[PDB]
Amino acid sequence: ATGGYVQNPSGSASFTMYSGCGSPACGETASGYTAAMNQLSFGAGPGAGAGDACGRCFALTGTADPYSPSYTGPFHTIVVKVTDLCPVAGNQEWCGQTTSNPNNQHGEPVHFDICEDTGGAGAFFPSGHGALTGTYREVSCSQWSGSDGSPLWTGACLSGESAANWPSTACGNKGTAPS
């Protein structure tokens, strides 16, 4: 996509959880399940505002535990709305994908950090299994439950929630992908 960001509607991803998404990079929260996406797919660097992932909805499916290969389940599928950025500089292990090294250390090209604040992390991760790998696919936000918060600053954007799936432009990417 423009800027060199990697924005495919479906593929492989890794998954973790985080707490604290009340001031997210898209500038607007949501009450349903939400996630941060690694910088190279989010479409903006830290402090740059909303990237083109903002507001888009994705079905996330766990398929493996990277710390226990023998674990065969149970896993879950949830639908999240992306509201936030998982930056290279703050989380290299999972979100360090760059144009020069497009996979994270766990071998995945995309990462979703699922927010605990609104329950998505508990819906997705079995207790005792807080990091997973699996798949993602962009879906209609009709499959997502919840409602959006109020914009935190001028430029806040979740307009990906009504856009056609990637490849396409809703909020738009900002700047250039991390190198």
Residue numbers in the entry: 5 to 183
Reproduce passages from the article.
Here we describe the first crystal structure of a beta‐1,4‐endoglucanase from a brown‐rot fungus, Gloeophyllum trabeum GtCel45A, which belongs to subfamily C of glycoside hydrolase family 45 (GH45). The enzyme consists of a single catalytic module folded into a six‐stranded double‐psi beta‐barrel domain surrounded by long loops. GtCel45A is very similar in sequence (82% identity) and structure to PcCel45A from the white‐rot fungus Phanerochaete chrysosporium.
